[PDB]
Amino acid sequence: YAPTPVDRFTFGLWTVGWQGRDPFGDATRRALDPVESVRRLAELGAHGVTFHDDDLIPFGSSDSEREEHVKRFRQALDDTGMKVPMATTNLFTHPVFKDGGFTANDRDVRRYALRKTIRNIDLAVELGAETYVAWGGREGAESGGAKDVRDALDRMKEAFDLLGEYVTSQGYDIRFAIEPKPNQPRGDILLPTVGHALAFIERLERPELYGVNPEVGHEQMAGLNFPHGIAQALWAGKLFHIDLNGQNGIKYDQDLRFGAGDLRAAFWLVDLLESAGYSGPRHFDFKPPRTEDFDGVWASAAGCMRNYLILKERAAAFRADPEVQEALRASRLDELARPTAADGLQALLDDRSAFEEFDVDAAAARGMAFERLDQLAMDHLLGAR
Amino acid sequence: YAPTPVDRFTFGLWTVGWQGRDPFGDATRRALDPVESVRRLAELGAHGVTFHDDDLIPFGSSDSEREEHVKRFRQALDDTGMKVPMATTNLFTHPVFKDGGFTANDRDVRRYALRKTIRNIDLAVELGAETYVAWGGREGAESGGAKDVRDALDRMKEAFDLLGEYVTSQGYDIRFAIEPKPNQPRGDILLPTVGHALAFIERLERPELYGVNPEVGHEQMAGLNFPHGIAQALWAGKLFHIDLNGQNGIKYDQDLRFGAGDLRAAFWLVDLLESAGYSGPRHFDFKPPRTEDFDGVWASAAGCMRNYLILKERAAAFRADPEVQEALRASRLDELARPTAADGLQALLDDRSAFEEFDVDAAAARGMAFERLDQLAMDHLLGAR
Amino acid sequence: YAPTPVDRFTFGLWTVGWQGRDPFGDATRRALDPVESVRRLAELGAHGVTFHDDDLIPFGSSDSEREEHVKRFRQALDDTGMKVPMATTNLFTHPVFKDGGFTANDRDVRRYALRKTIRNIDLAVELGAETYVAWGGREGAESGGAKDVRDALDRMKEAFDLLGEYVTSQGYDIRFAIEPKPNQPRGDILLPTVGHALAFIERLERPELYGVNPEVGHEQMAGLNFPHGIAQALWAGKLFHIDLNGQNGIKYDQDLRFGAGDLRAAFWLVDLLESAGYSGPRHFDFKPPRTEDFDGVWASAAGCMRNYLILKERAAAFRADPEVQEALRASRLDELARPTAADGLQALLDDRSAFEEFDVDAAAARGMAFERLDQLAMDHLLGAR
Amino acid sequence: YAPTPVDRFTFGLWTVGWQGRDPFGDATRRALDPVESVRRLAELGAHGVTFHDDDLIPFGSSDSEREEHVKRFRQALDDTGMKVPMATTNLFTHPVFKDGGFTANDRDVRRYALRKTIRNIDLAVELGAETYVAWGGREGAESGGAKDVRDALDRMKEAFDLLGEYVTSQGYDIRFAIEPKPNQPRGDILLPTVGHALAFIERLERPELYGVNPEVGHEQMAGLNFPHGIAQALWAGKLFHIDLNGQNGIKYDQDLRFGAGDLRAAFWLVDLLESAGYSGPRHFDFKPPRTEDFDGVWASAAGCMRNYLILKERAAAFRADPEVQEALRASRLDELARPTAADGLQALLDDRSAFEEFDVDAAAARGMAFERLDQLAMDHLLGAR
Ligand SMILES: OC[C@H]1O[C@H](O)[C@H](O)[C@@H](O)[C@@H]1O
Ligand SMILES: OC[C@H]1O[C@H](O)[C@H](O)[C@@H](O)[C@@H]1O
Ligand SMILES: OC[C@H]1O[C@H](O)[C@H](O)[C@@H](O)[C@@H]1O
Ligand SMILES: OC[C@H]1O[C@H](O)[C@H](O)[C@@H](O)[C@@H]1O
Ligand SMILES: [Mn+2]
Ligand SMILES: [Mn+2]
Ligand SMILES: [Mn+2]
Ligand SMILES: [Mn+2]
Ligand SMILES: [Mn+2]
Ligand SMILES: [Mn+2]
Ligand SMILES: [Mn+2]
Ligand SMILES: [Mn+2]
């Protein structure tokens, strides 16, 4: 199960380069030079990398240090053939962002957050990124009175509408993806799920420039079904990007490697992405645990990819299995894909078979045969057919 | 703290009339006649009641029994002055709806679910209802392969678009509210939160006819902040109705009386509804616990109202308190309500005070003073000023 | 992957005989005659069945109907070779138990609950049961003031101590297992987890008669790791029985078939049970979903067993894999099984290599190699070696 | 509502001295000198402080720097009258503890963890501490195969048994309290709840030396009822210490000030502690949010105390209220405190009123009147009588 660049696997620089600092402990690993991560990931078979501004250029770097960092990184991309499909901004680490960036109560901070983002959009475009992610990790509150949410949503829409004016006036071909998270590091984060992000999009001045970048474990932090959410984002035509990882239930953000956490959910996610022809990057936003040395970091990264390809093969087997096709029919999945009333409203109202003469008892008595189907899915997932 | 009908408190017939059957136990109370609940609630000071079809007219009633039930109920409404501001359909109890109504895999069942809903919309309009709620409690799955979600969302949009054609072609002044629930009785329910419902609305053919009816405990079943959600629904102009109740965290749907559960959340909810001028009904969808006899059912109902009025008084006190106004200013809530860049994009980009000469350290150092504000909110909530 | 009676698979009568009544819906299946379930499960390869009193003998049956029910059931057990290794009492369905059985506030109800249990212990002993389970599903509260917990725990210990006097004075060879559940149908249930049950046991007059019967999904309802809990119960020598099933996170009790829910957790559970030589029954307390007809009920039951045997084979493969043995050593699992200080306290204190001359940095730098090991476990689980 | 030292309020040095570093951000506050925190808290009315070793003496300090730090701290305690009732060890921050201290897989690390703890027990005893807390924040795993739990529990019991030999052989009057946490920073922590800790205690060689130090938000991280847990620990006679704070449901460890989070739970906690005569310290383990400057840190600390005293007054009012006493009787709380069968087993079995002639229907019909009682509790909590 060997990845190739045609699999479009990507990694954040902050992923394999996580040092292991957690709220109760110090770093357990040395910093990695982004050049060195690009080389190592290229060897493992990745397609590309992603970055926040501050991962690539140390906060408070001069225009000339900034130059030199970008040039070195550009050489590593040239030497390995790695691409940069997505970039993002850090509006969460520096103390100035303690109450948010775009929805900080202090106006001067909201202004600075905009300008910091605009500077990186330009960079992202120079390096060939097609999608620009926004994760408002600091947009939220620990207390009720601290954030008037309606005002916050105004400010949030104001910032996104301004980004969108910028990119339109510059003629850039970059689209935006909002990344929802329900909590952590704030007590409650604004736009906490895929639905909240999707709803909010529809209120921007130019909605066609914005989609979502949902993350497996974030939605699972609210106990939601991640494939269902992704199906809703696909149905809206808004799945611009996706972050893949693992989460063991409702608890702090674990960012385990893909396939770890809820495995069956990983299976139905891959089945969905592949059957709906999602063609974007398969981006891993994971942290190798702080128990690991560098060898462990590379093994965790490889494991991400391996588990995708294994789950890709089993889901493909599932759907090609004639016995599965027969069960899908037994379960009336085919009828679900037929319109309920293509005949129209009037015809429905005049059709006695839909009400006055509908046999509710006999309809009630039909089993759905879902358990047989789900065990077929289990046997395929475990390679036990 | 005495309710009056001008408080617009309402109750579902199914609330006080819950018999106490739970998945592990039999009824502990006798059935109540809807006439008797209307009278008792009128005495307690309620404004009105709501109903599913099947609460009012026993499933499988003739056209003439249906007549007689409606006439008796109409007399009780006339005798007490009670209104019926909202109605809804039961598409969840009968076995025929075991895989859903609008998104059942079997097409014939989807058709019947539509016709059952249309019959009640007419009734609801006769009785003066302004809002028609849809709670798709059976729309969902326990397993991955049983429900193609994109197909399901098609079917769901098809049904709502058809309801909306019906009401438009009949000239009715009724609007629809979708009620989200994340799970139970299905393993995962479609449109599981306020955001998912809001997003979905925007894809209907006539969005202006549809809003949400969020329920305190449902959103809390996914660990979300309910006031934040309600602020988002208000911001979208979609809060058509609201169900009030209590939930003790992430667990089965408790439907405790309003004020029970997360009390501070009830406080910030009331503060929001009242400050934003929500003028709809204050509807309680609660179950008096199965430990209670009829006296207990009426005491629980009264408690719903009492807790609203107590939390209304304390939130009003909070916001009128000059020391609170000073703290809100200390916390820069006023600046949050100012546009980040009314000057426009170009002016922002040319303003050196927003970046090149912005003093990040001194901005970083300013405290937000949120803890002082939140303790003011606590002292007001507890009457300890 | 075919079960045999030597696999010791058992089923509750209430499992396959669940009619599908949930809090929002009516039955979707007809009642099954216990004789018919015994025959069908014997065919599927089960070893035995379990029962509450009230599943076997309808509540309010005469001494003579009681006779006739027991005799018919005894014939089915004789005809099929099925055993009854566990029994239990229903102290949760009848209205009289609305505030509990053993910890009801009303004393007369606590007395009746004892006598109802004692009558069934005798029956259980006649039918050859070795373990008698207690699930206090109604012992708890929705509100703070309703249950003085210290008093409740007195009452709870009083009842168990009385059961234990009864069985000792009768000379029965039956042991008791407490089954923890954190909530549902009460807002909070007493002894909500495995640990709480284990702790409580140690306060009974004869602790050696009582262990736990933990259930996969119950512990997962509190977000706990179920294999860790089971390891603690094994370590205490208290795993007398176990209920196997599936749960998709923190939400209502789903009781999905074994292997559904958190699959990786099912894998590490089976690896534990098998490596520690648990020899008790492998008992499924699941509900076939209400979407299913009778064929679906039997397919769900078979699936329970199949998934156990598949996960048994993969865990066995994992532990026999020399590359896994090498990784376990690489991860110092062997050193974990060595005493930290067999040399004793004084020797530890005098050993400079443990402190004054311990090289913390070089110890810090060693990776644990856990990610490589966990991917080996993943490849074995998926059959991808 | 002014605290005095007779209220026995304490604070960890790490609480008010938290700098605000979270997993996604840098410090927002400067470090505080422990001398300065002792003075400021004494002014606010606290009784005392607690410390980990490493809060007081920087890790890697010489024997002489260690001397000088302790002497300065001792002077501040002398100047203010502050006591040190509890101490603890940091076995979680340094990289060496990445896989735990007492249950690290590497034996040499387990040895060092013991010696680091023993050195501080001596210090704690010199400063007058009566309780020594152990929080095994790093004892656990992210993956199944990394930690054999039975072996881990051996190691855990080995370490505690060794601590207990040390203190017994030195003649110290210090007792140990284990502090449970279900997760974070590990994926699952060993002894994740109050019950698991209580159960484990009973397996130590000298159980009478060990109790629990439960923390409000930790138990709430598993969705448990914290007052119920504390009632169980009191019932076992093991509540040696308690950490008070606030948590908004199942999510990362928030450590909000006491009274924030689940307010009603804070109320029933205080009602319990006060009615059962808990005489230990009322210790706050909270973090002032990172939004706050130093003024905010002191306001948050004061708020902790204020909310305790306000909830102390309301619970006291509740229980003295003759109408509440009447309701408690109406709800048969008095009967719950009476033995179920002081008459004994034989008398129960011979008492026909307990079974053959027990009127189950009439018992079933009695309401428990719990909702009236709970609204009395609400009116008292809000000062609305
Ligand atoms: O979206 C940008 C990335 O920023 C941070 O590292 C967030 O924790 C991560 O989840 C997000 O994916
Ligand atoms: O929405 C209609 C009502 O239907 C059912 O009783 C649901 O449980 C309830 O939550 C919903 O509010
Ligand atoms: O323990 C007896 C059995 O009783 C009920 O059916 C409980 O829901 C089940 O979980 C328990 O296993
Ligand atoms: O127990 C010692 C203290 O150590 C750490 O600061 C833990 O996070 C805290 O919860 C615990 O109370
Ligand atoms: Mn994440
Ligand atoms: Mn991400
Ligand atoms: Mn509800
Ligand atoms: Mn509702
Ligand atoms: Mn269960
Ligand atoms: Mn069970
Ligand atoms: Mn904590
Ligand atoms: Mn603590």
HEC letters along D208-276: HHEEECCEHHHHHCCCCCHHHHHHHHHHCCCECCCEECECCCCCCCCCECECECCHHHHHHHHHHHHHC
Length of chain A: 385
Strands C188-189 and C140-141: antiparallel
Q: Do the Cβ atoms of D265 and C141 come closer than 8 Å?
A: no
Distance CA D32, CA D301 (A): 15
Distance CA C65, CA C82 (A): 23
Distance of CA D14 from the midpoint of ligand 11 (Å): 12
Among C223, C232, C339, whose Cβ lies nearest the Cβ of D250?
Answer: C223
Q: Which two tokens stand for residue D88?
A: 């603890």
Among C292, C375, C383, whose Cβ lies nearest the Cβ of A382?
Answer: C383
Q: Report the atom number in ligand 2 closest to the C-alpha of B253.
A: 8
Q: Which residue has the tokens 């005569």?
A: D277
Q: Which residue has the tokens 């462990």?
A: A296
| A329: Cβ contacts below 8 Å, ≥ 6 apart | none
Packing angle of the helix pair A226-235, B149-170 (nearest 10 deg)? 60
Closest CA to C249 of B196, A217, B325, A160: A217
Q: Do the Cβ atoms of A327 and B139 come closer than 8 Å?
A: no
Cβ density class A109-127: b for 16+ within 10 Å, e for less: bbbbbbbbbbebbebbbeb
Q: Which two tokens stand for residue C109?
A: 């109800």
Nearest CA to ligand 4 atom 1: D135
Distance CA A110, CA A136 (A): 12
- Whether B290 has its CB under 8 Å from any CB of chain D: the answer is no
Opening angle at CA B194, ends B188 and B196, nearest 5: 60
Amino acid code (one letter) for B287: K
Cα Dmax for chain C: 80
| D344: Cβ contacts below 8 Å, ≥ 6 apart | none
Distance CA B118, CA B132 (A): 11
Coil, strand or helix at A133? strand
Question: For residue C132, which ligand has an atom nearest its CA?
Answer: 3
- Whether B260 has its CB under 8 Å from any CB of chain C: the answer is yes
- Whether D288 has its CB under 8 Å from any CB of chain B: the answer is yes
> What values do phi and psi take at A89, rounded to 5?
-115, 145
Elucidation method: X-ray
DSSP string of C230-269, one letter each residue: HHHHHHTT-B---EE-B--SSSS---BPBTBS-HHHHHHH
Among D249, D261, D379, whose Cβ lies nearest the Cβ of B250?
Answer: D249
- Stretch (H or E) spanning C165: helix C149-170
| Exposed/middle/buried for residue D321 (C-beta within 10 Å: 0-12, 13-18, 19+) | middle
Of C251, C286, C297, which to mutate for an interface test with B (greatest number of B Cβ within 10 Å)? Answer: C251
In sign, the C-alpha dihedral spanning A94, A96, A101, A105 is positive
DSSP string of C90-128, one letter each residue: --SSSGGGTT-STT-SSHHHHHHHHHHHHHHHHHHHHTT
Q: Do the Cβ atoms of B312 and B278 come closer than 8 Å?
A: no
Estimate to the nearest angstrom the gap between the alpha carbon of B10 and the chain centroid. 12
| Exposed/middle/buried for residue C21 (C-beta within 10 Å: 0-12, 13-18, 19+) | middle
Cα torsion through D10, D16, D21, D22, rounded to 10: 50
Packing angle of the helix pair B194-201, B226-235 (nearest 10 deg)? 20
- For chains A and B, CB pairs below 8 A equal 332
Q: Which two tokens stand for residue B124?
A: 């609801």
Q: Which residues pair with C307 in a beta bridge?
A: none
The CA distances from residue A53 to A19, A39, A58, D74, in Å, are 18, 19, 8, 47
Amino acid code (one letter) for A161: D
Q: Report the atom number in ligand 3 closest to the C-alpha of C243.
A: 12
Q: Do the Cβ atoms of D52 and D18 come closer than 8 Å?
A: no
Query: C305 CA to chain A: closest CA distance, Å?
Result: 11
- What residue in B sits closest to C288 (Cα-Cα)? B142
Distance of CA D302 from the midpoint of ligand 12 (Å): 18
Q: Which residues pair with C283 in a beta bridge?
A: C10, C243
Q: Which residue has the tokens 């308690």?
A: D242
Distance CA A98, CA A86 (A): 25
Ligand 1 lined by A179 (C-beta under 6 Å) = yes
**Chains near C (3 or more Cβ pairs under 8 Å):** A, B, D
Q: Annotated catalytic residue: which of B53, B54, B55, B271?
A: B55
Query: C262 CA to chain B: closest CA distance, Å?
Result: 13
Of C22, C24, C184, C220, which to mutate for an interface test with B (greatest number of B Cβ within 10 Å)? Answer: C24
DSSP state of A95: G
- For chains A and C, CB pairs below 8 A equal 120
- What residue in A sits closest to B144 (Cα-Cα)? A268
Amino acid code (one letter) for B15: T
Distance CA D27, CA D29 (A): 6
Distance CA B323, CA B326 (A): 5
Strands C86-88 and A48-52: unpaired
Q: Which two tokens stand for residue A180?
A: 């929802």
Distance CA C162, CA C199 (A): 19
Ligand 1 lined by A176 (C-beta under 6 Å) = no
Closest CA to A19 of D137, D255, C364, D57: C364
Amino acid code (one letter) for C99: D
Q: Do the Cβ atoms of C110 and C155 come closer than 8 Å?
A: yes
Estimate to the nearest angstrom the gap between the alpha carbon of A208 and the chain centroid. 18
Q: Which two tokens stand for residue A305?
A: 């990819």
Distance CA D218, CA D240 (A): 17
Omega of the bond prior to A185 within 30 degrees of 0, cis? yes
Q: Which two tokens stand for residue D318?
A: 């509740």
Closest CA to C354 of A292, D176, D117: D117
DSSP state of A251: S
Q: Which residues of A are catalytic?
A: 52, 55
> What values do phi and psi take at D53, rounded to 5?
-45, -55
DSSP string of C264-331, one letter each residue: HHHHHHHHHHHHTT--S-EEE-----TT--HHHHHHHHHHHHHHHHHHHHHHHHHHH-HHHHHHHHHT
Opening angle at CA D89, ends D84 and D90, nearest 5: 125
Distance CA D90, CA D53 (A): 6
Task: Determine whether the annotation assigns residue B196 to a binding site.
Answer: no
Q: Do A145 and B235 touch (CB under 8 A)?
A: no
Distance CA A228, CA C28 (A): 26
Distance of CA D360 from the midpoint of ligand 9 (Å): 27
Closest CA to C308 of B296, A382, B179: A382
Closest CA to C52 of C104, C129, C111: C129
In sign, the C-alpha dihedral spanning D97, D98, D103, D109 is negative
Opening angle at CA A105, ends A101 and A106, nearest 5: 80
DSSP string of D144-193, one letter each residue: GGG--HHHHHHHHHHHHHHHHHHHHHHT---EEEE---SSSSSSEESS-S
Cβ density class B200-212: b for 16+ within 10 Å, e for less: bbbbbeeeebbbb
D33 part of the active site: no
Distance CA D127, CA D233 (A): 27
| Exposed/middle/buried for residue C161 (C-beta within 10 Å: 0-12, 13-18, 19+) | middle
Distance CA B220, CA B223 (A): 5
Distance CA B156, CA A372 (A): 26
Distance of CA D60 from the midpoint of ligand 12 (Å): 24
Q: Do the Cβ atoms of A251 and D185 come closer than 8 Å?
A: no
Q: Which two tokens stand for residue C17?
A: 């005989």
Estimate to the nearest angstrom the gap between the alpha carbon of B265 and the chain centroid. 15
Helices (DSSP H) in chain B: which residue ranges? 13-16, 34-44, 53-56, 63-80, 107-126, 149-170, 194-201, 216-220, 226-235, 263-275, 294-320, 322-330, 333-336, 345-350, 360-364, 370-382
Length of chain C: 385
Q: Which two tokens stand for residue A92?
A: 């969460």
Q: Which residue has the tokens 């970059």?
A: A174
Q: Which two tokens stand for residue A337?
A: 């894909």
Distance CA D96, CA D102 (A): 12
B-facing residues of A in 5-64 (CB < 8 A) are none
Omega of the bond prior to D185 within 30 degrees of 0, cis? yes
Q: Do the Cβ atoms of C35 and C16 come closer than 8 Å?
A: no
Of A121, A172, A178, A232, which to mutate for an interface test with B (greatest number of B Cβ within 10 Å)? Answer: A232
Distance of CA B215 from the midpoint of ligand 2 (Å): 9
Distance CA B63, CA A300 (A): 67
Opening angle at CA B93, ends B91 and B95, nearest 5: 100
Q: Do the Cβ atoms of B192 and B186 come closer than 8 Å?
A: no
| Exposed/middle/buried for residue C97 (C-beta within 10 Å: 0-12, 13-18, 19+) | buried
Q: Do D143 and C363 touch (CB under 8 A)?
A: no
> What values do phi and psi take at D28, rounded to 5?
-115, -5
Distance CA A147, CA C64 (A): 70
Ligand 2 lined by B179 (C-beta under 6 Å) = yes
Domains (ranges, CATH) in chain C? 1-385 (3.20.20.150)
Q: Which residue has the tokens 């991917």?
A: C375
| Exposed/middle/buried for residue D202 (C-beta within 10 Å: 0-12, 13-18, 19+) | middle
Closest CA to C254 of D347, B251, B360, B365: B251
Number of alpha carbons in the 13 Å side-chain half-sphere of residue C313: 13
Q: Do B142 and C289 touch (CB under 8 A)?
A: yes
Q: Do the Cβ atoms of A106 and B335 come closer than 8 Å?
A: yes
Ligand 1 lined by A132 (C-beta under 6 Å) = no
Question: How many CB atoms within 10 Å of residue B78?
Answer: 9
- Stretch (H or E) spanning D72: helix D63-80
Among A145, A271, A345, whose Cβ lies nearest the Cβ of B166?
Answer: A345
Omega of the bond prior to B185 within 30 degrees of 0, cis? yes
Question: How many CB atoms within 10 Å of residue D154?
Answer: 18
Omega of the bond prior to B5 within 30 degrees of 0, cis? no
Closest CA to C311 of C222, C216, C237: C216
In sign, the C-alpha dihedral spanning A12, A13, A19, A22 is negative
DSSP state of D354: G
Distance CA B64, CA B62 (A): 5
Cβ density class C186-224: b for 16+ within 10 Å, e for less: bbbbbbbbbbbbbbbbbbbeeeebbbbbbbbbbbbbbbb
- Stretch (H or E) spanning D361: helix D360-364
Strands B140-141 and B243-244: unpaired
